């Protein structure tokens, strides 16, 4: 049911398997239900996990969808992670 995504600084983020599989890249890494991200720090990976919860909730819902917030200080590294994980 859950998987563990570990940031470059050792923070362990635990999310549902279904959320984690929205990334094709993570699905590939998972086939321990753990994945180590040696280049994605904690302030990027936590935002990634927030996006999973946001994507799953607001895909197919028509209730008015809110902006996904990205602080300017986080955008460059979030872009690099999103680009690498294809999401």
């Amino acid at each position: 049911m859950y998987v563990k995504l570990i940031s470059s600084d050792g923070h362990e983020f635990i999310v549902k398997r279904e959320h984690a599989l929205t990334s094709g890249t993570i699905k590939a890494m998972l086939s321990t239900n753990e994945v180590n991200f040696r280049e994605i720090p904690s302030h990027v990976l936590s935002k990634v996990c927030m996006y999973f919860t946001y994507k799953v909730r607001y895909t197919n819902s028509s209730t008015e969808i809110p902006e996904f917030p990205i602080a300017p200080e986080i955008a460059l590294e979030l872009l690099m992670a999103a680009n690498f994980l294809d999401c």
């Binding site: 923070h11 983020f13 549902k16 936590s46 919860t53 607001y58 917030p69 200080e73």
Partner: protein
């Protein structure tokens, strides 16, 4: 009504959701399924405030408006090993200086 949470202790962070009507104890049962630790060996906090088992997440102020999916509410987690550790949550890494451009 769904509330969206980060249950956080040390360098552990659980992303899960629950109902406003569900109870702190039921939240602890969810922690049990993941970290394999019984409720009586867990204390849950909203900030520094110790949360009582019978209270609903809504009464503890975890509401649809403040525990959103893109912006989850933090719930502190503390274990006991015959004494309970203090509540400790290690912060996330800090972003680098904003580049001259942004």
């Amino acid at each position: 009504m769904d509330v969206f949470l980060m249950i956080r202790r040390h360098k552990t962070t659980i992303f899960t959701d629950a109902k406003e009507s569900s109870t702190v104890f039921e939240l602890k049962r969810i922690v049990e399924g993941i970290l394999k630790r019984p409720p009586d060996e867990q204390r849950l906090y909203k900030d520094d405030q110790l949360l009582d088992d019978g209270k609903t997440l809504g009464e503890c102020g975890f509401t649809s408006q403040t525990a959103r999916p893109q912006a989850p509410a933090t719930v502190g987690l503390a274990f006991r090993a015959d004494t309970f550790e203090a509540l400790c949550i290690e912060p996330f890494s800090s972003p680098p200086e904003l580049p001259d451009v942004m």
